[PDB]
Design an enzyme around this catalytic site. Sequence first.
Site, PDB file in Angstrom:
ATOM      1  N   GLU A 408       1.060  -1.560 -12.515  1.00 46.71           N
ATOM      2  CA  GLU A 408       1.369  -1.628 -11.088  1.00 46.71           C
ATOM      3  C   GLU A 408       1.957  -2.970 -10.670  1.00 46.71           C
ATOM      4  O   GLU A 408       2.737  -3.034  -9.725  1.00 46.71           O
ATOM      5  CB  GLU A 408       0.150  -1.286 -10.237  1.00 46.71           C
ATOM      6  CG  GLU A 408      -0.350   0.148 -10.400  1.00 46.71           C
ATOM      7  CD  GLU A 408       0.606   1.205  -9.852  1.00 46.71           C
ATOM      8  OE1 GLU A 408       1.281   0.948  -8.823  1.00 46.71           O
ATOM      9  OE2 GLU A 408       0.664   2.299 -10.463  1.00 46.71           O
ATOM     10  N   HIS A 411       5.604  -3.010 -10.328  1.00 49.71           N
ATOM     11  CA  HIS A 411       6.110  -2.488  -9.052  1.00 49.71           C
ATOM     12  C   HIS A 411       6.309  -3.594  -8.007  1.00 49.71           C
ATOM     13  O   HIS A 411       7.268  -3.555  -7.237  1.00 49.71           O
ATOM     14  CB  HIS A 411       5.189  -1.399  -8.486  1.00 49.71           C
ATOM     15  CG  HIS A 411       5.285  -0.075  -9.188  1.00 49.71           C
ATOM     16  ND1 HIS A 411       6.450   0.392  -9.754  1.00 49.71           N
ATOM     17  CD2 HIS A 411       4.365   0.901  -9.369  1.00 49.71           C
ATOM     18  CE1 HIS A 411       6.238   1.587 -10.275  1.00 49.71           C
ATOM     19  NE2 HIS A 411       4.979   1.919 -10.056  1.00 49.71           N
ATOM     20  N   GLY A 421      16.074  -5.069  -0.297  1.00 49.85           N
ATOM     21  CA  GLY A 421      15.693  -4.170   0.790  1.00 49.85           C
ATOM     22  C   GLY A 421      14.269  -3.671   0.636  1.00 49.85           C
ATOM     23  O   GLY A 421      13.503  -4.199  -0.172  1.00 49.85           O
TER      24      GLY A 421
HETATM   25 ZN   LIG Z   1       3.807   2.842 -11.626  1.00 51.13          ZN
END
Ligand SMILES: [Zn+2]
EC number: 3.4.24.3
Length: 672
Positions: A408, A411, A421
């Site tokens: 994660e 991300h 953006g």
């Molecule tokens: Zn993921």
Amino acid sequence: TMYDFEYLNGLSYTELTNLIKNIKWNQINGLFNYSTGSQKFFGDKNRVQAIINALQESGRTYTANDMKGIETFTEVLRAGFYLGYYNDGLSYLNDRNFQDKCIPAMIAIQKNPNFKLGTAVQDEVITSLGKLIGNASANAEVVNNCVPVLKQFRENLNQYAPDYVKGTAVNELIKGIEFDFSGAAYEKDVKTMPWYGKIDPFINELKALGLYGNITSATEWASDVGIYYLSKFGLYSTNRNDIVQSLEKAVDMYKYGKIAFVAMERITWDYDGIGSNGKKVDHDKFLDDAEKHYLPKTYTFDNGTFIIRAGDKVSEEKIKRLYWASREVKSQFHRVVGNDKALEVGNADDVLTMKIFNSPEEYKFNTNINGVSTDNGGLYIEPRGTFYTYERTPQQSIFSLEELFRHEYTHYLQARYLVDGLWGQGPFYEKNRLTWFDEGTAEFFAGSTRTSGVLPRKLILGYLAKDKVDHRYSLKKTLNSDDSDWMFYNYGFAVAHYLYEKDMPTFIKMNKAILNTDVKSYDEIIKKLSDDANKNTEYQNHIQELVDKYQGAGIPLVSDDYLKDHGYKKASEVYSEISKAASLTNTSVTAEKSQYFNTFTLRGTYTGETSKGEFKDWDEMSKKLDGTLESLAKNSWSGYKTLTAYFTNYRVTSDNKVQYDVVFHGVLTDNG
Ligand SMILES: [Zn+2]
């Protein structure tokens, strides 16, 4: 044994009612369907009346052994009112005045000595009664007759609430009455209901259930129903504050548990968020207090730009590893992408907050607290800089806390350094483009290592161990996706790794495309890959090569060497030793204070020999820099084992000399 309306309409009422008494509701074909036969069946005001009366007689006689078809007698009537709702011509069945004709029958069922929980029949009767009320009517007399059933359920709460039958029966009985009552006073004045202020015995029975206190995992829902409907029915109480007081008592009783949140929701929505004292209940503060209860510990890294708020049970070791893990993924990501400067100024992600709960159970309350899905192992909200997760055991989940975090974390990086953006809301998302990429490259960057680039993660190679037949996605299929099975992300990774290992030039050109916000470029690349069949065979064999790597694959995890007490090394020395070893020029450094240690970030320029071409340069730069990190770790200062390094902004001098911005990060044990 399957009946039609065109048969039932020709029967006498005496014959019809008798028939219904000993058949199941589903034996009637198109019962809930609107037909010319259906219209004719329920269009007869006398026929429905005959059914209502037959129900009344059935409710007056029924025993524990025979239901006397009360379920069937209730469903036909439900079909009547249901069709009377959606279709004109049966609109007389919609009128509550006619629906009141069911009450005499309802009363008959309640006055029966067998109106209690016991046998499957007795339970289904309460259930069928409850369902009827929802479509028909209740008055107050019938509502108050439910008390002995609620008392009976409450008195044996620890035995009946885990069972589906008795539990469902009481839930349906309450839910149905509430449904009729609310719909009746939809916009009308509540003070002017036939039951208003007369259902106190019923209301009080919900307090008793709601405020039971001694609850388990099995019976929590029952007191939840108690509180929820204490609020709803409490609108028909002659004392507002009395009910609110009980709801306030629910909060204090089950503090920071499901029923606390329900009761607080009930105050704000049903009672204007006003207390029993008459002052505005601060709902925010409650959530603020709830979060502090579940996330009491704070750990601050990188001068406060990396904050972990965590449960009292999550190990301090993990906290440290998770920091160091972030630093690996960061470096690898930055190598491949070639940008470390943030795209947007003044964002949320300037501070990365991670909220880690003690366990999955405790994790669920996050959605009450911060209003985000919790049906997940974890979630990264970009507009907030926030990653929500929970500590897990090996049983609770197959990903561990770090494995999940590394995934994660990528991300956060993607959103901050890669996609200009709002993440998921730019030109790149106007069409389905990065679905495989975002999820794929993240599975991939989770494999980051300190000195060995990015490696695959065992568990993922584990998934690819399945049917080779069809199933195995083609390069065409992977790049282009609404529906696709769970394996989609596993092949998405297979592409990202394929490009990494077998075709860096493409992989780099792809990231530059995203980086520069060039959709045209990116699409040309995806088209070239999908249209070329040789690139698919290259890919198809690579998947097999990954499946070959599984047997002896590992899970990239931050090393025990990070946690060791390294001891004092002078600052000036570390820098010099790194700067020389990495041939860096024009260096600057920043020291950042953390919770358990300090860290430095060294920023330098490296100018090499003549260029071998961007992609050959990148490969050599990687090997040279990973070499520098391993050699420094041969030194006696344990600290060099915390080092991570990367390179960005590839360029070439007027004399064709390789050039990079190079960054080192590691522990700092010098204070001055
Ligand atoms: Zn993921």
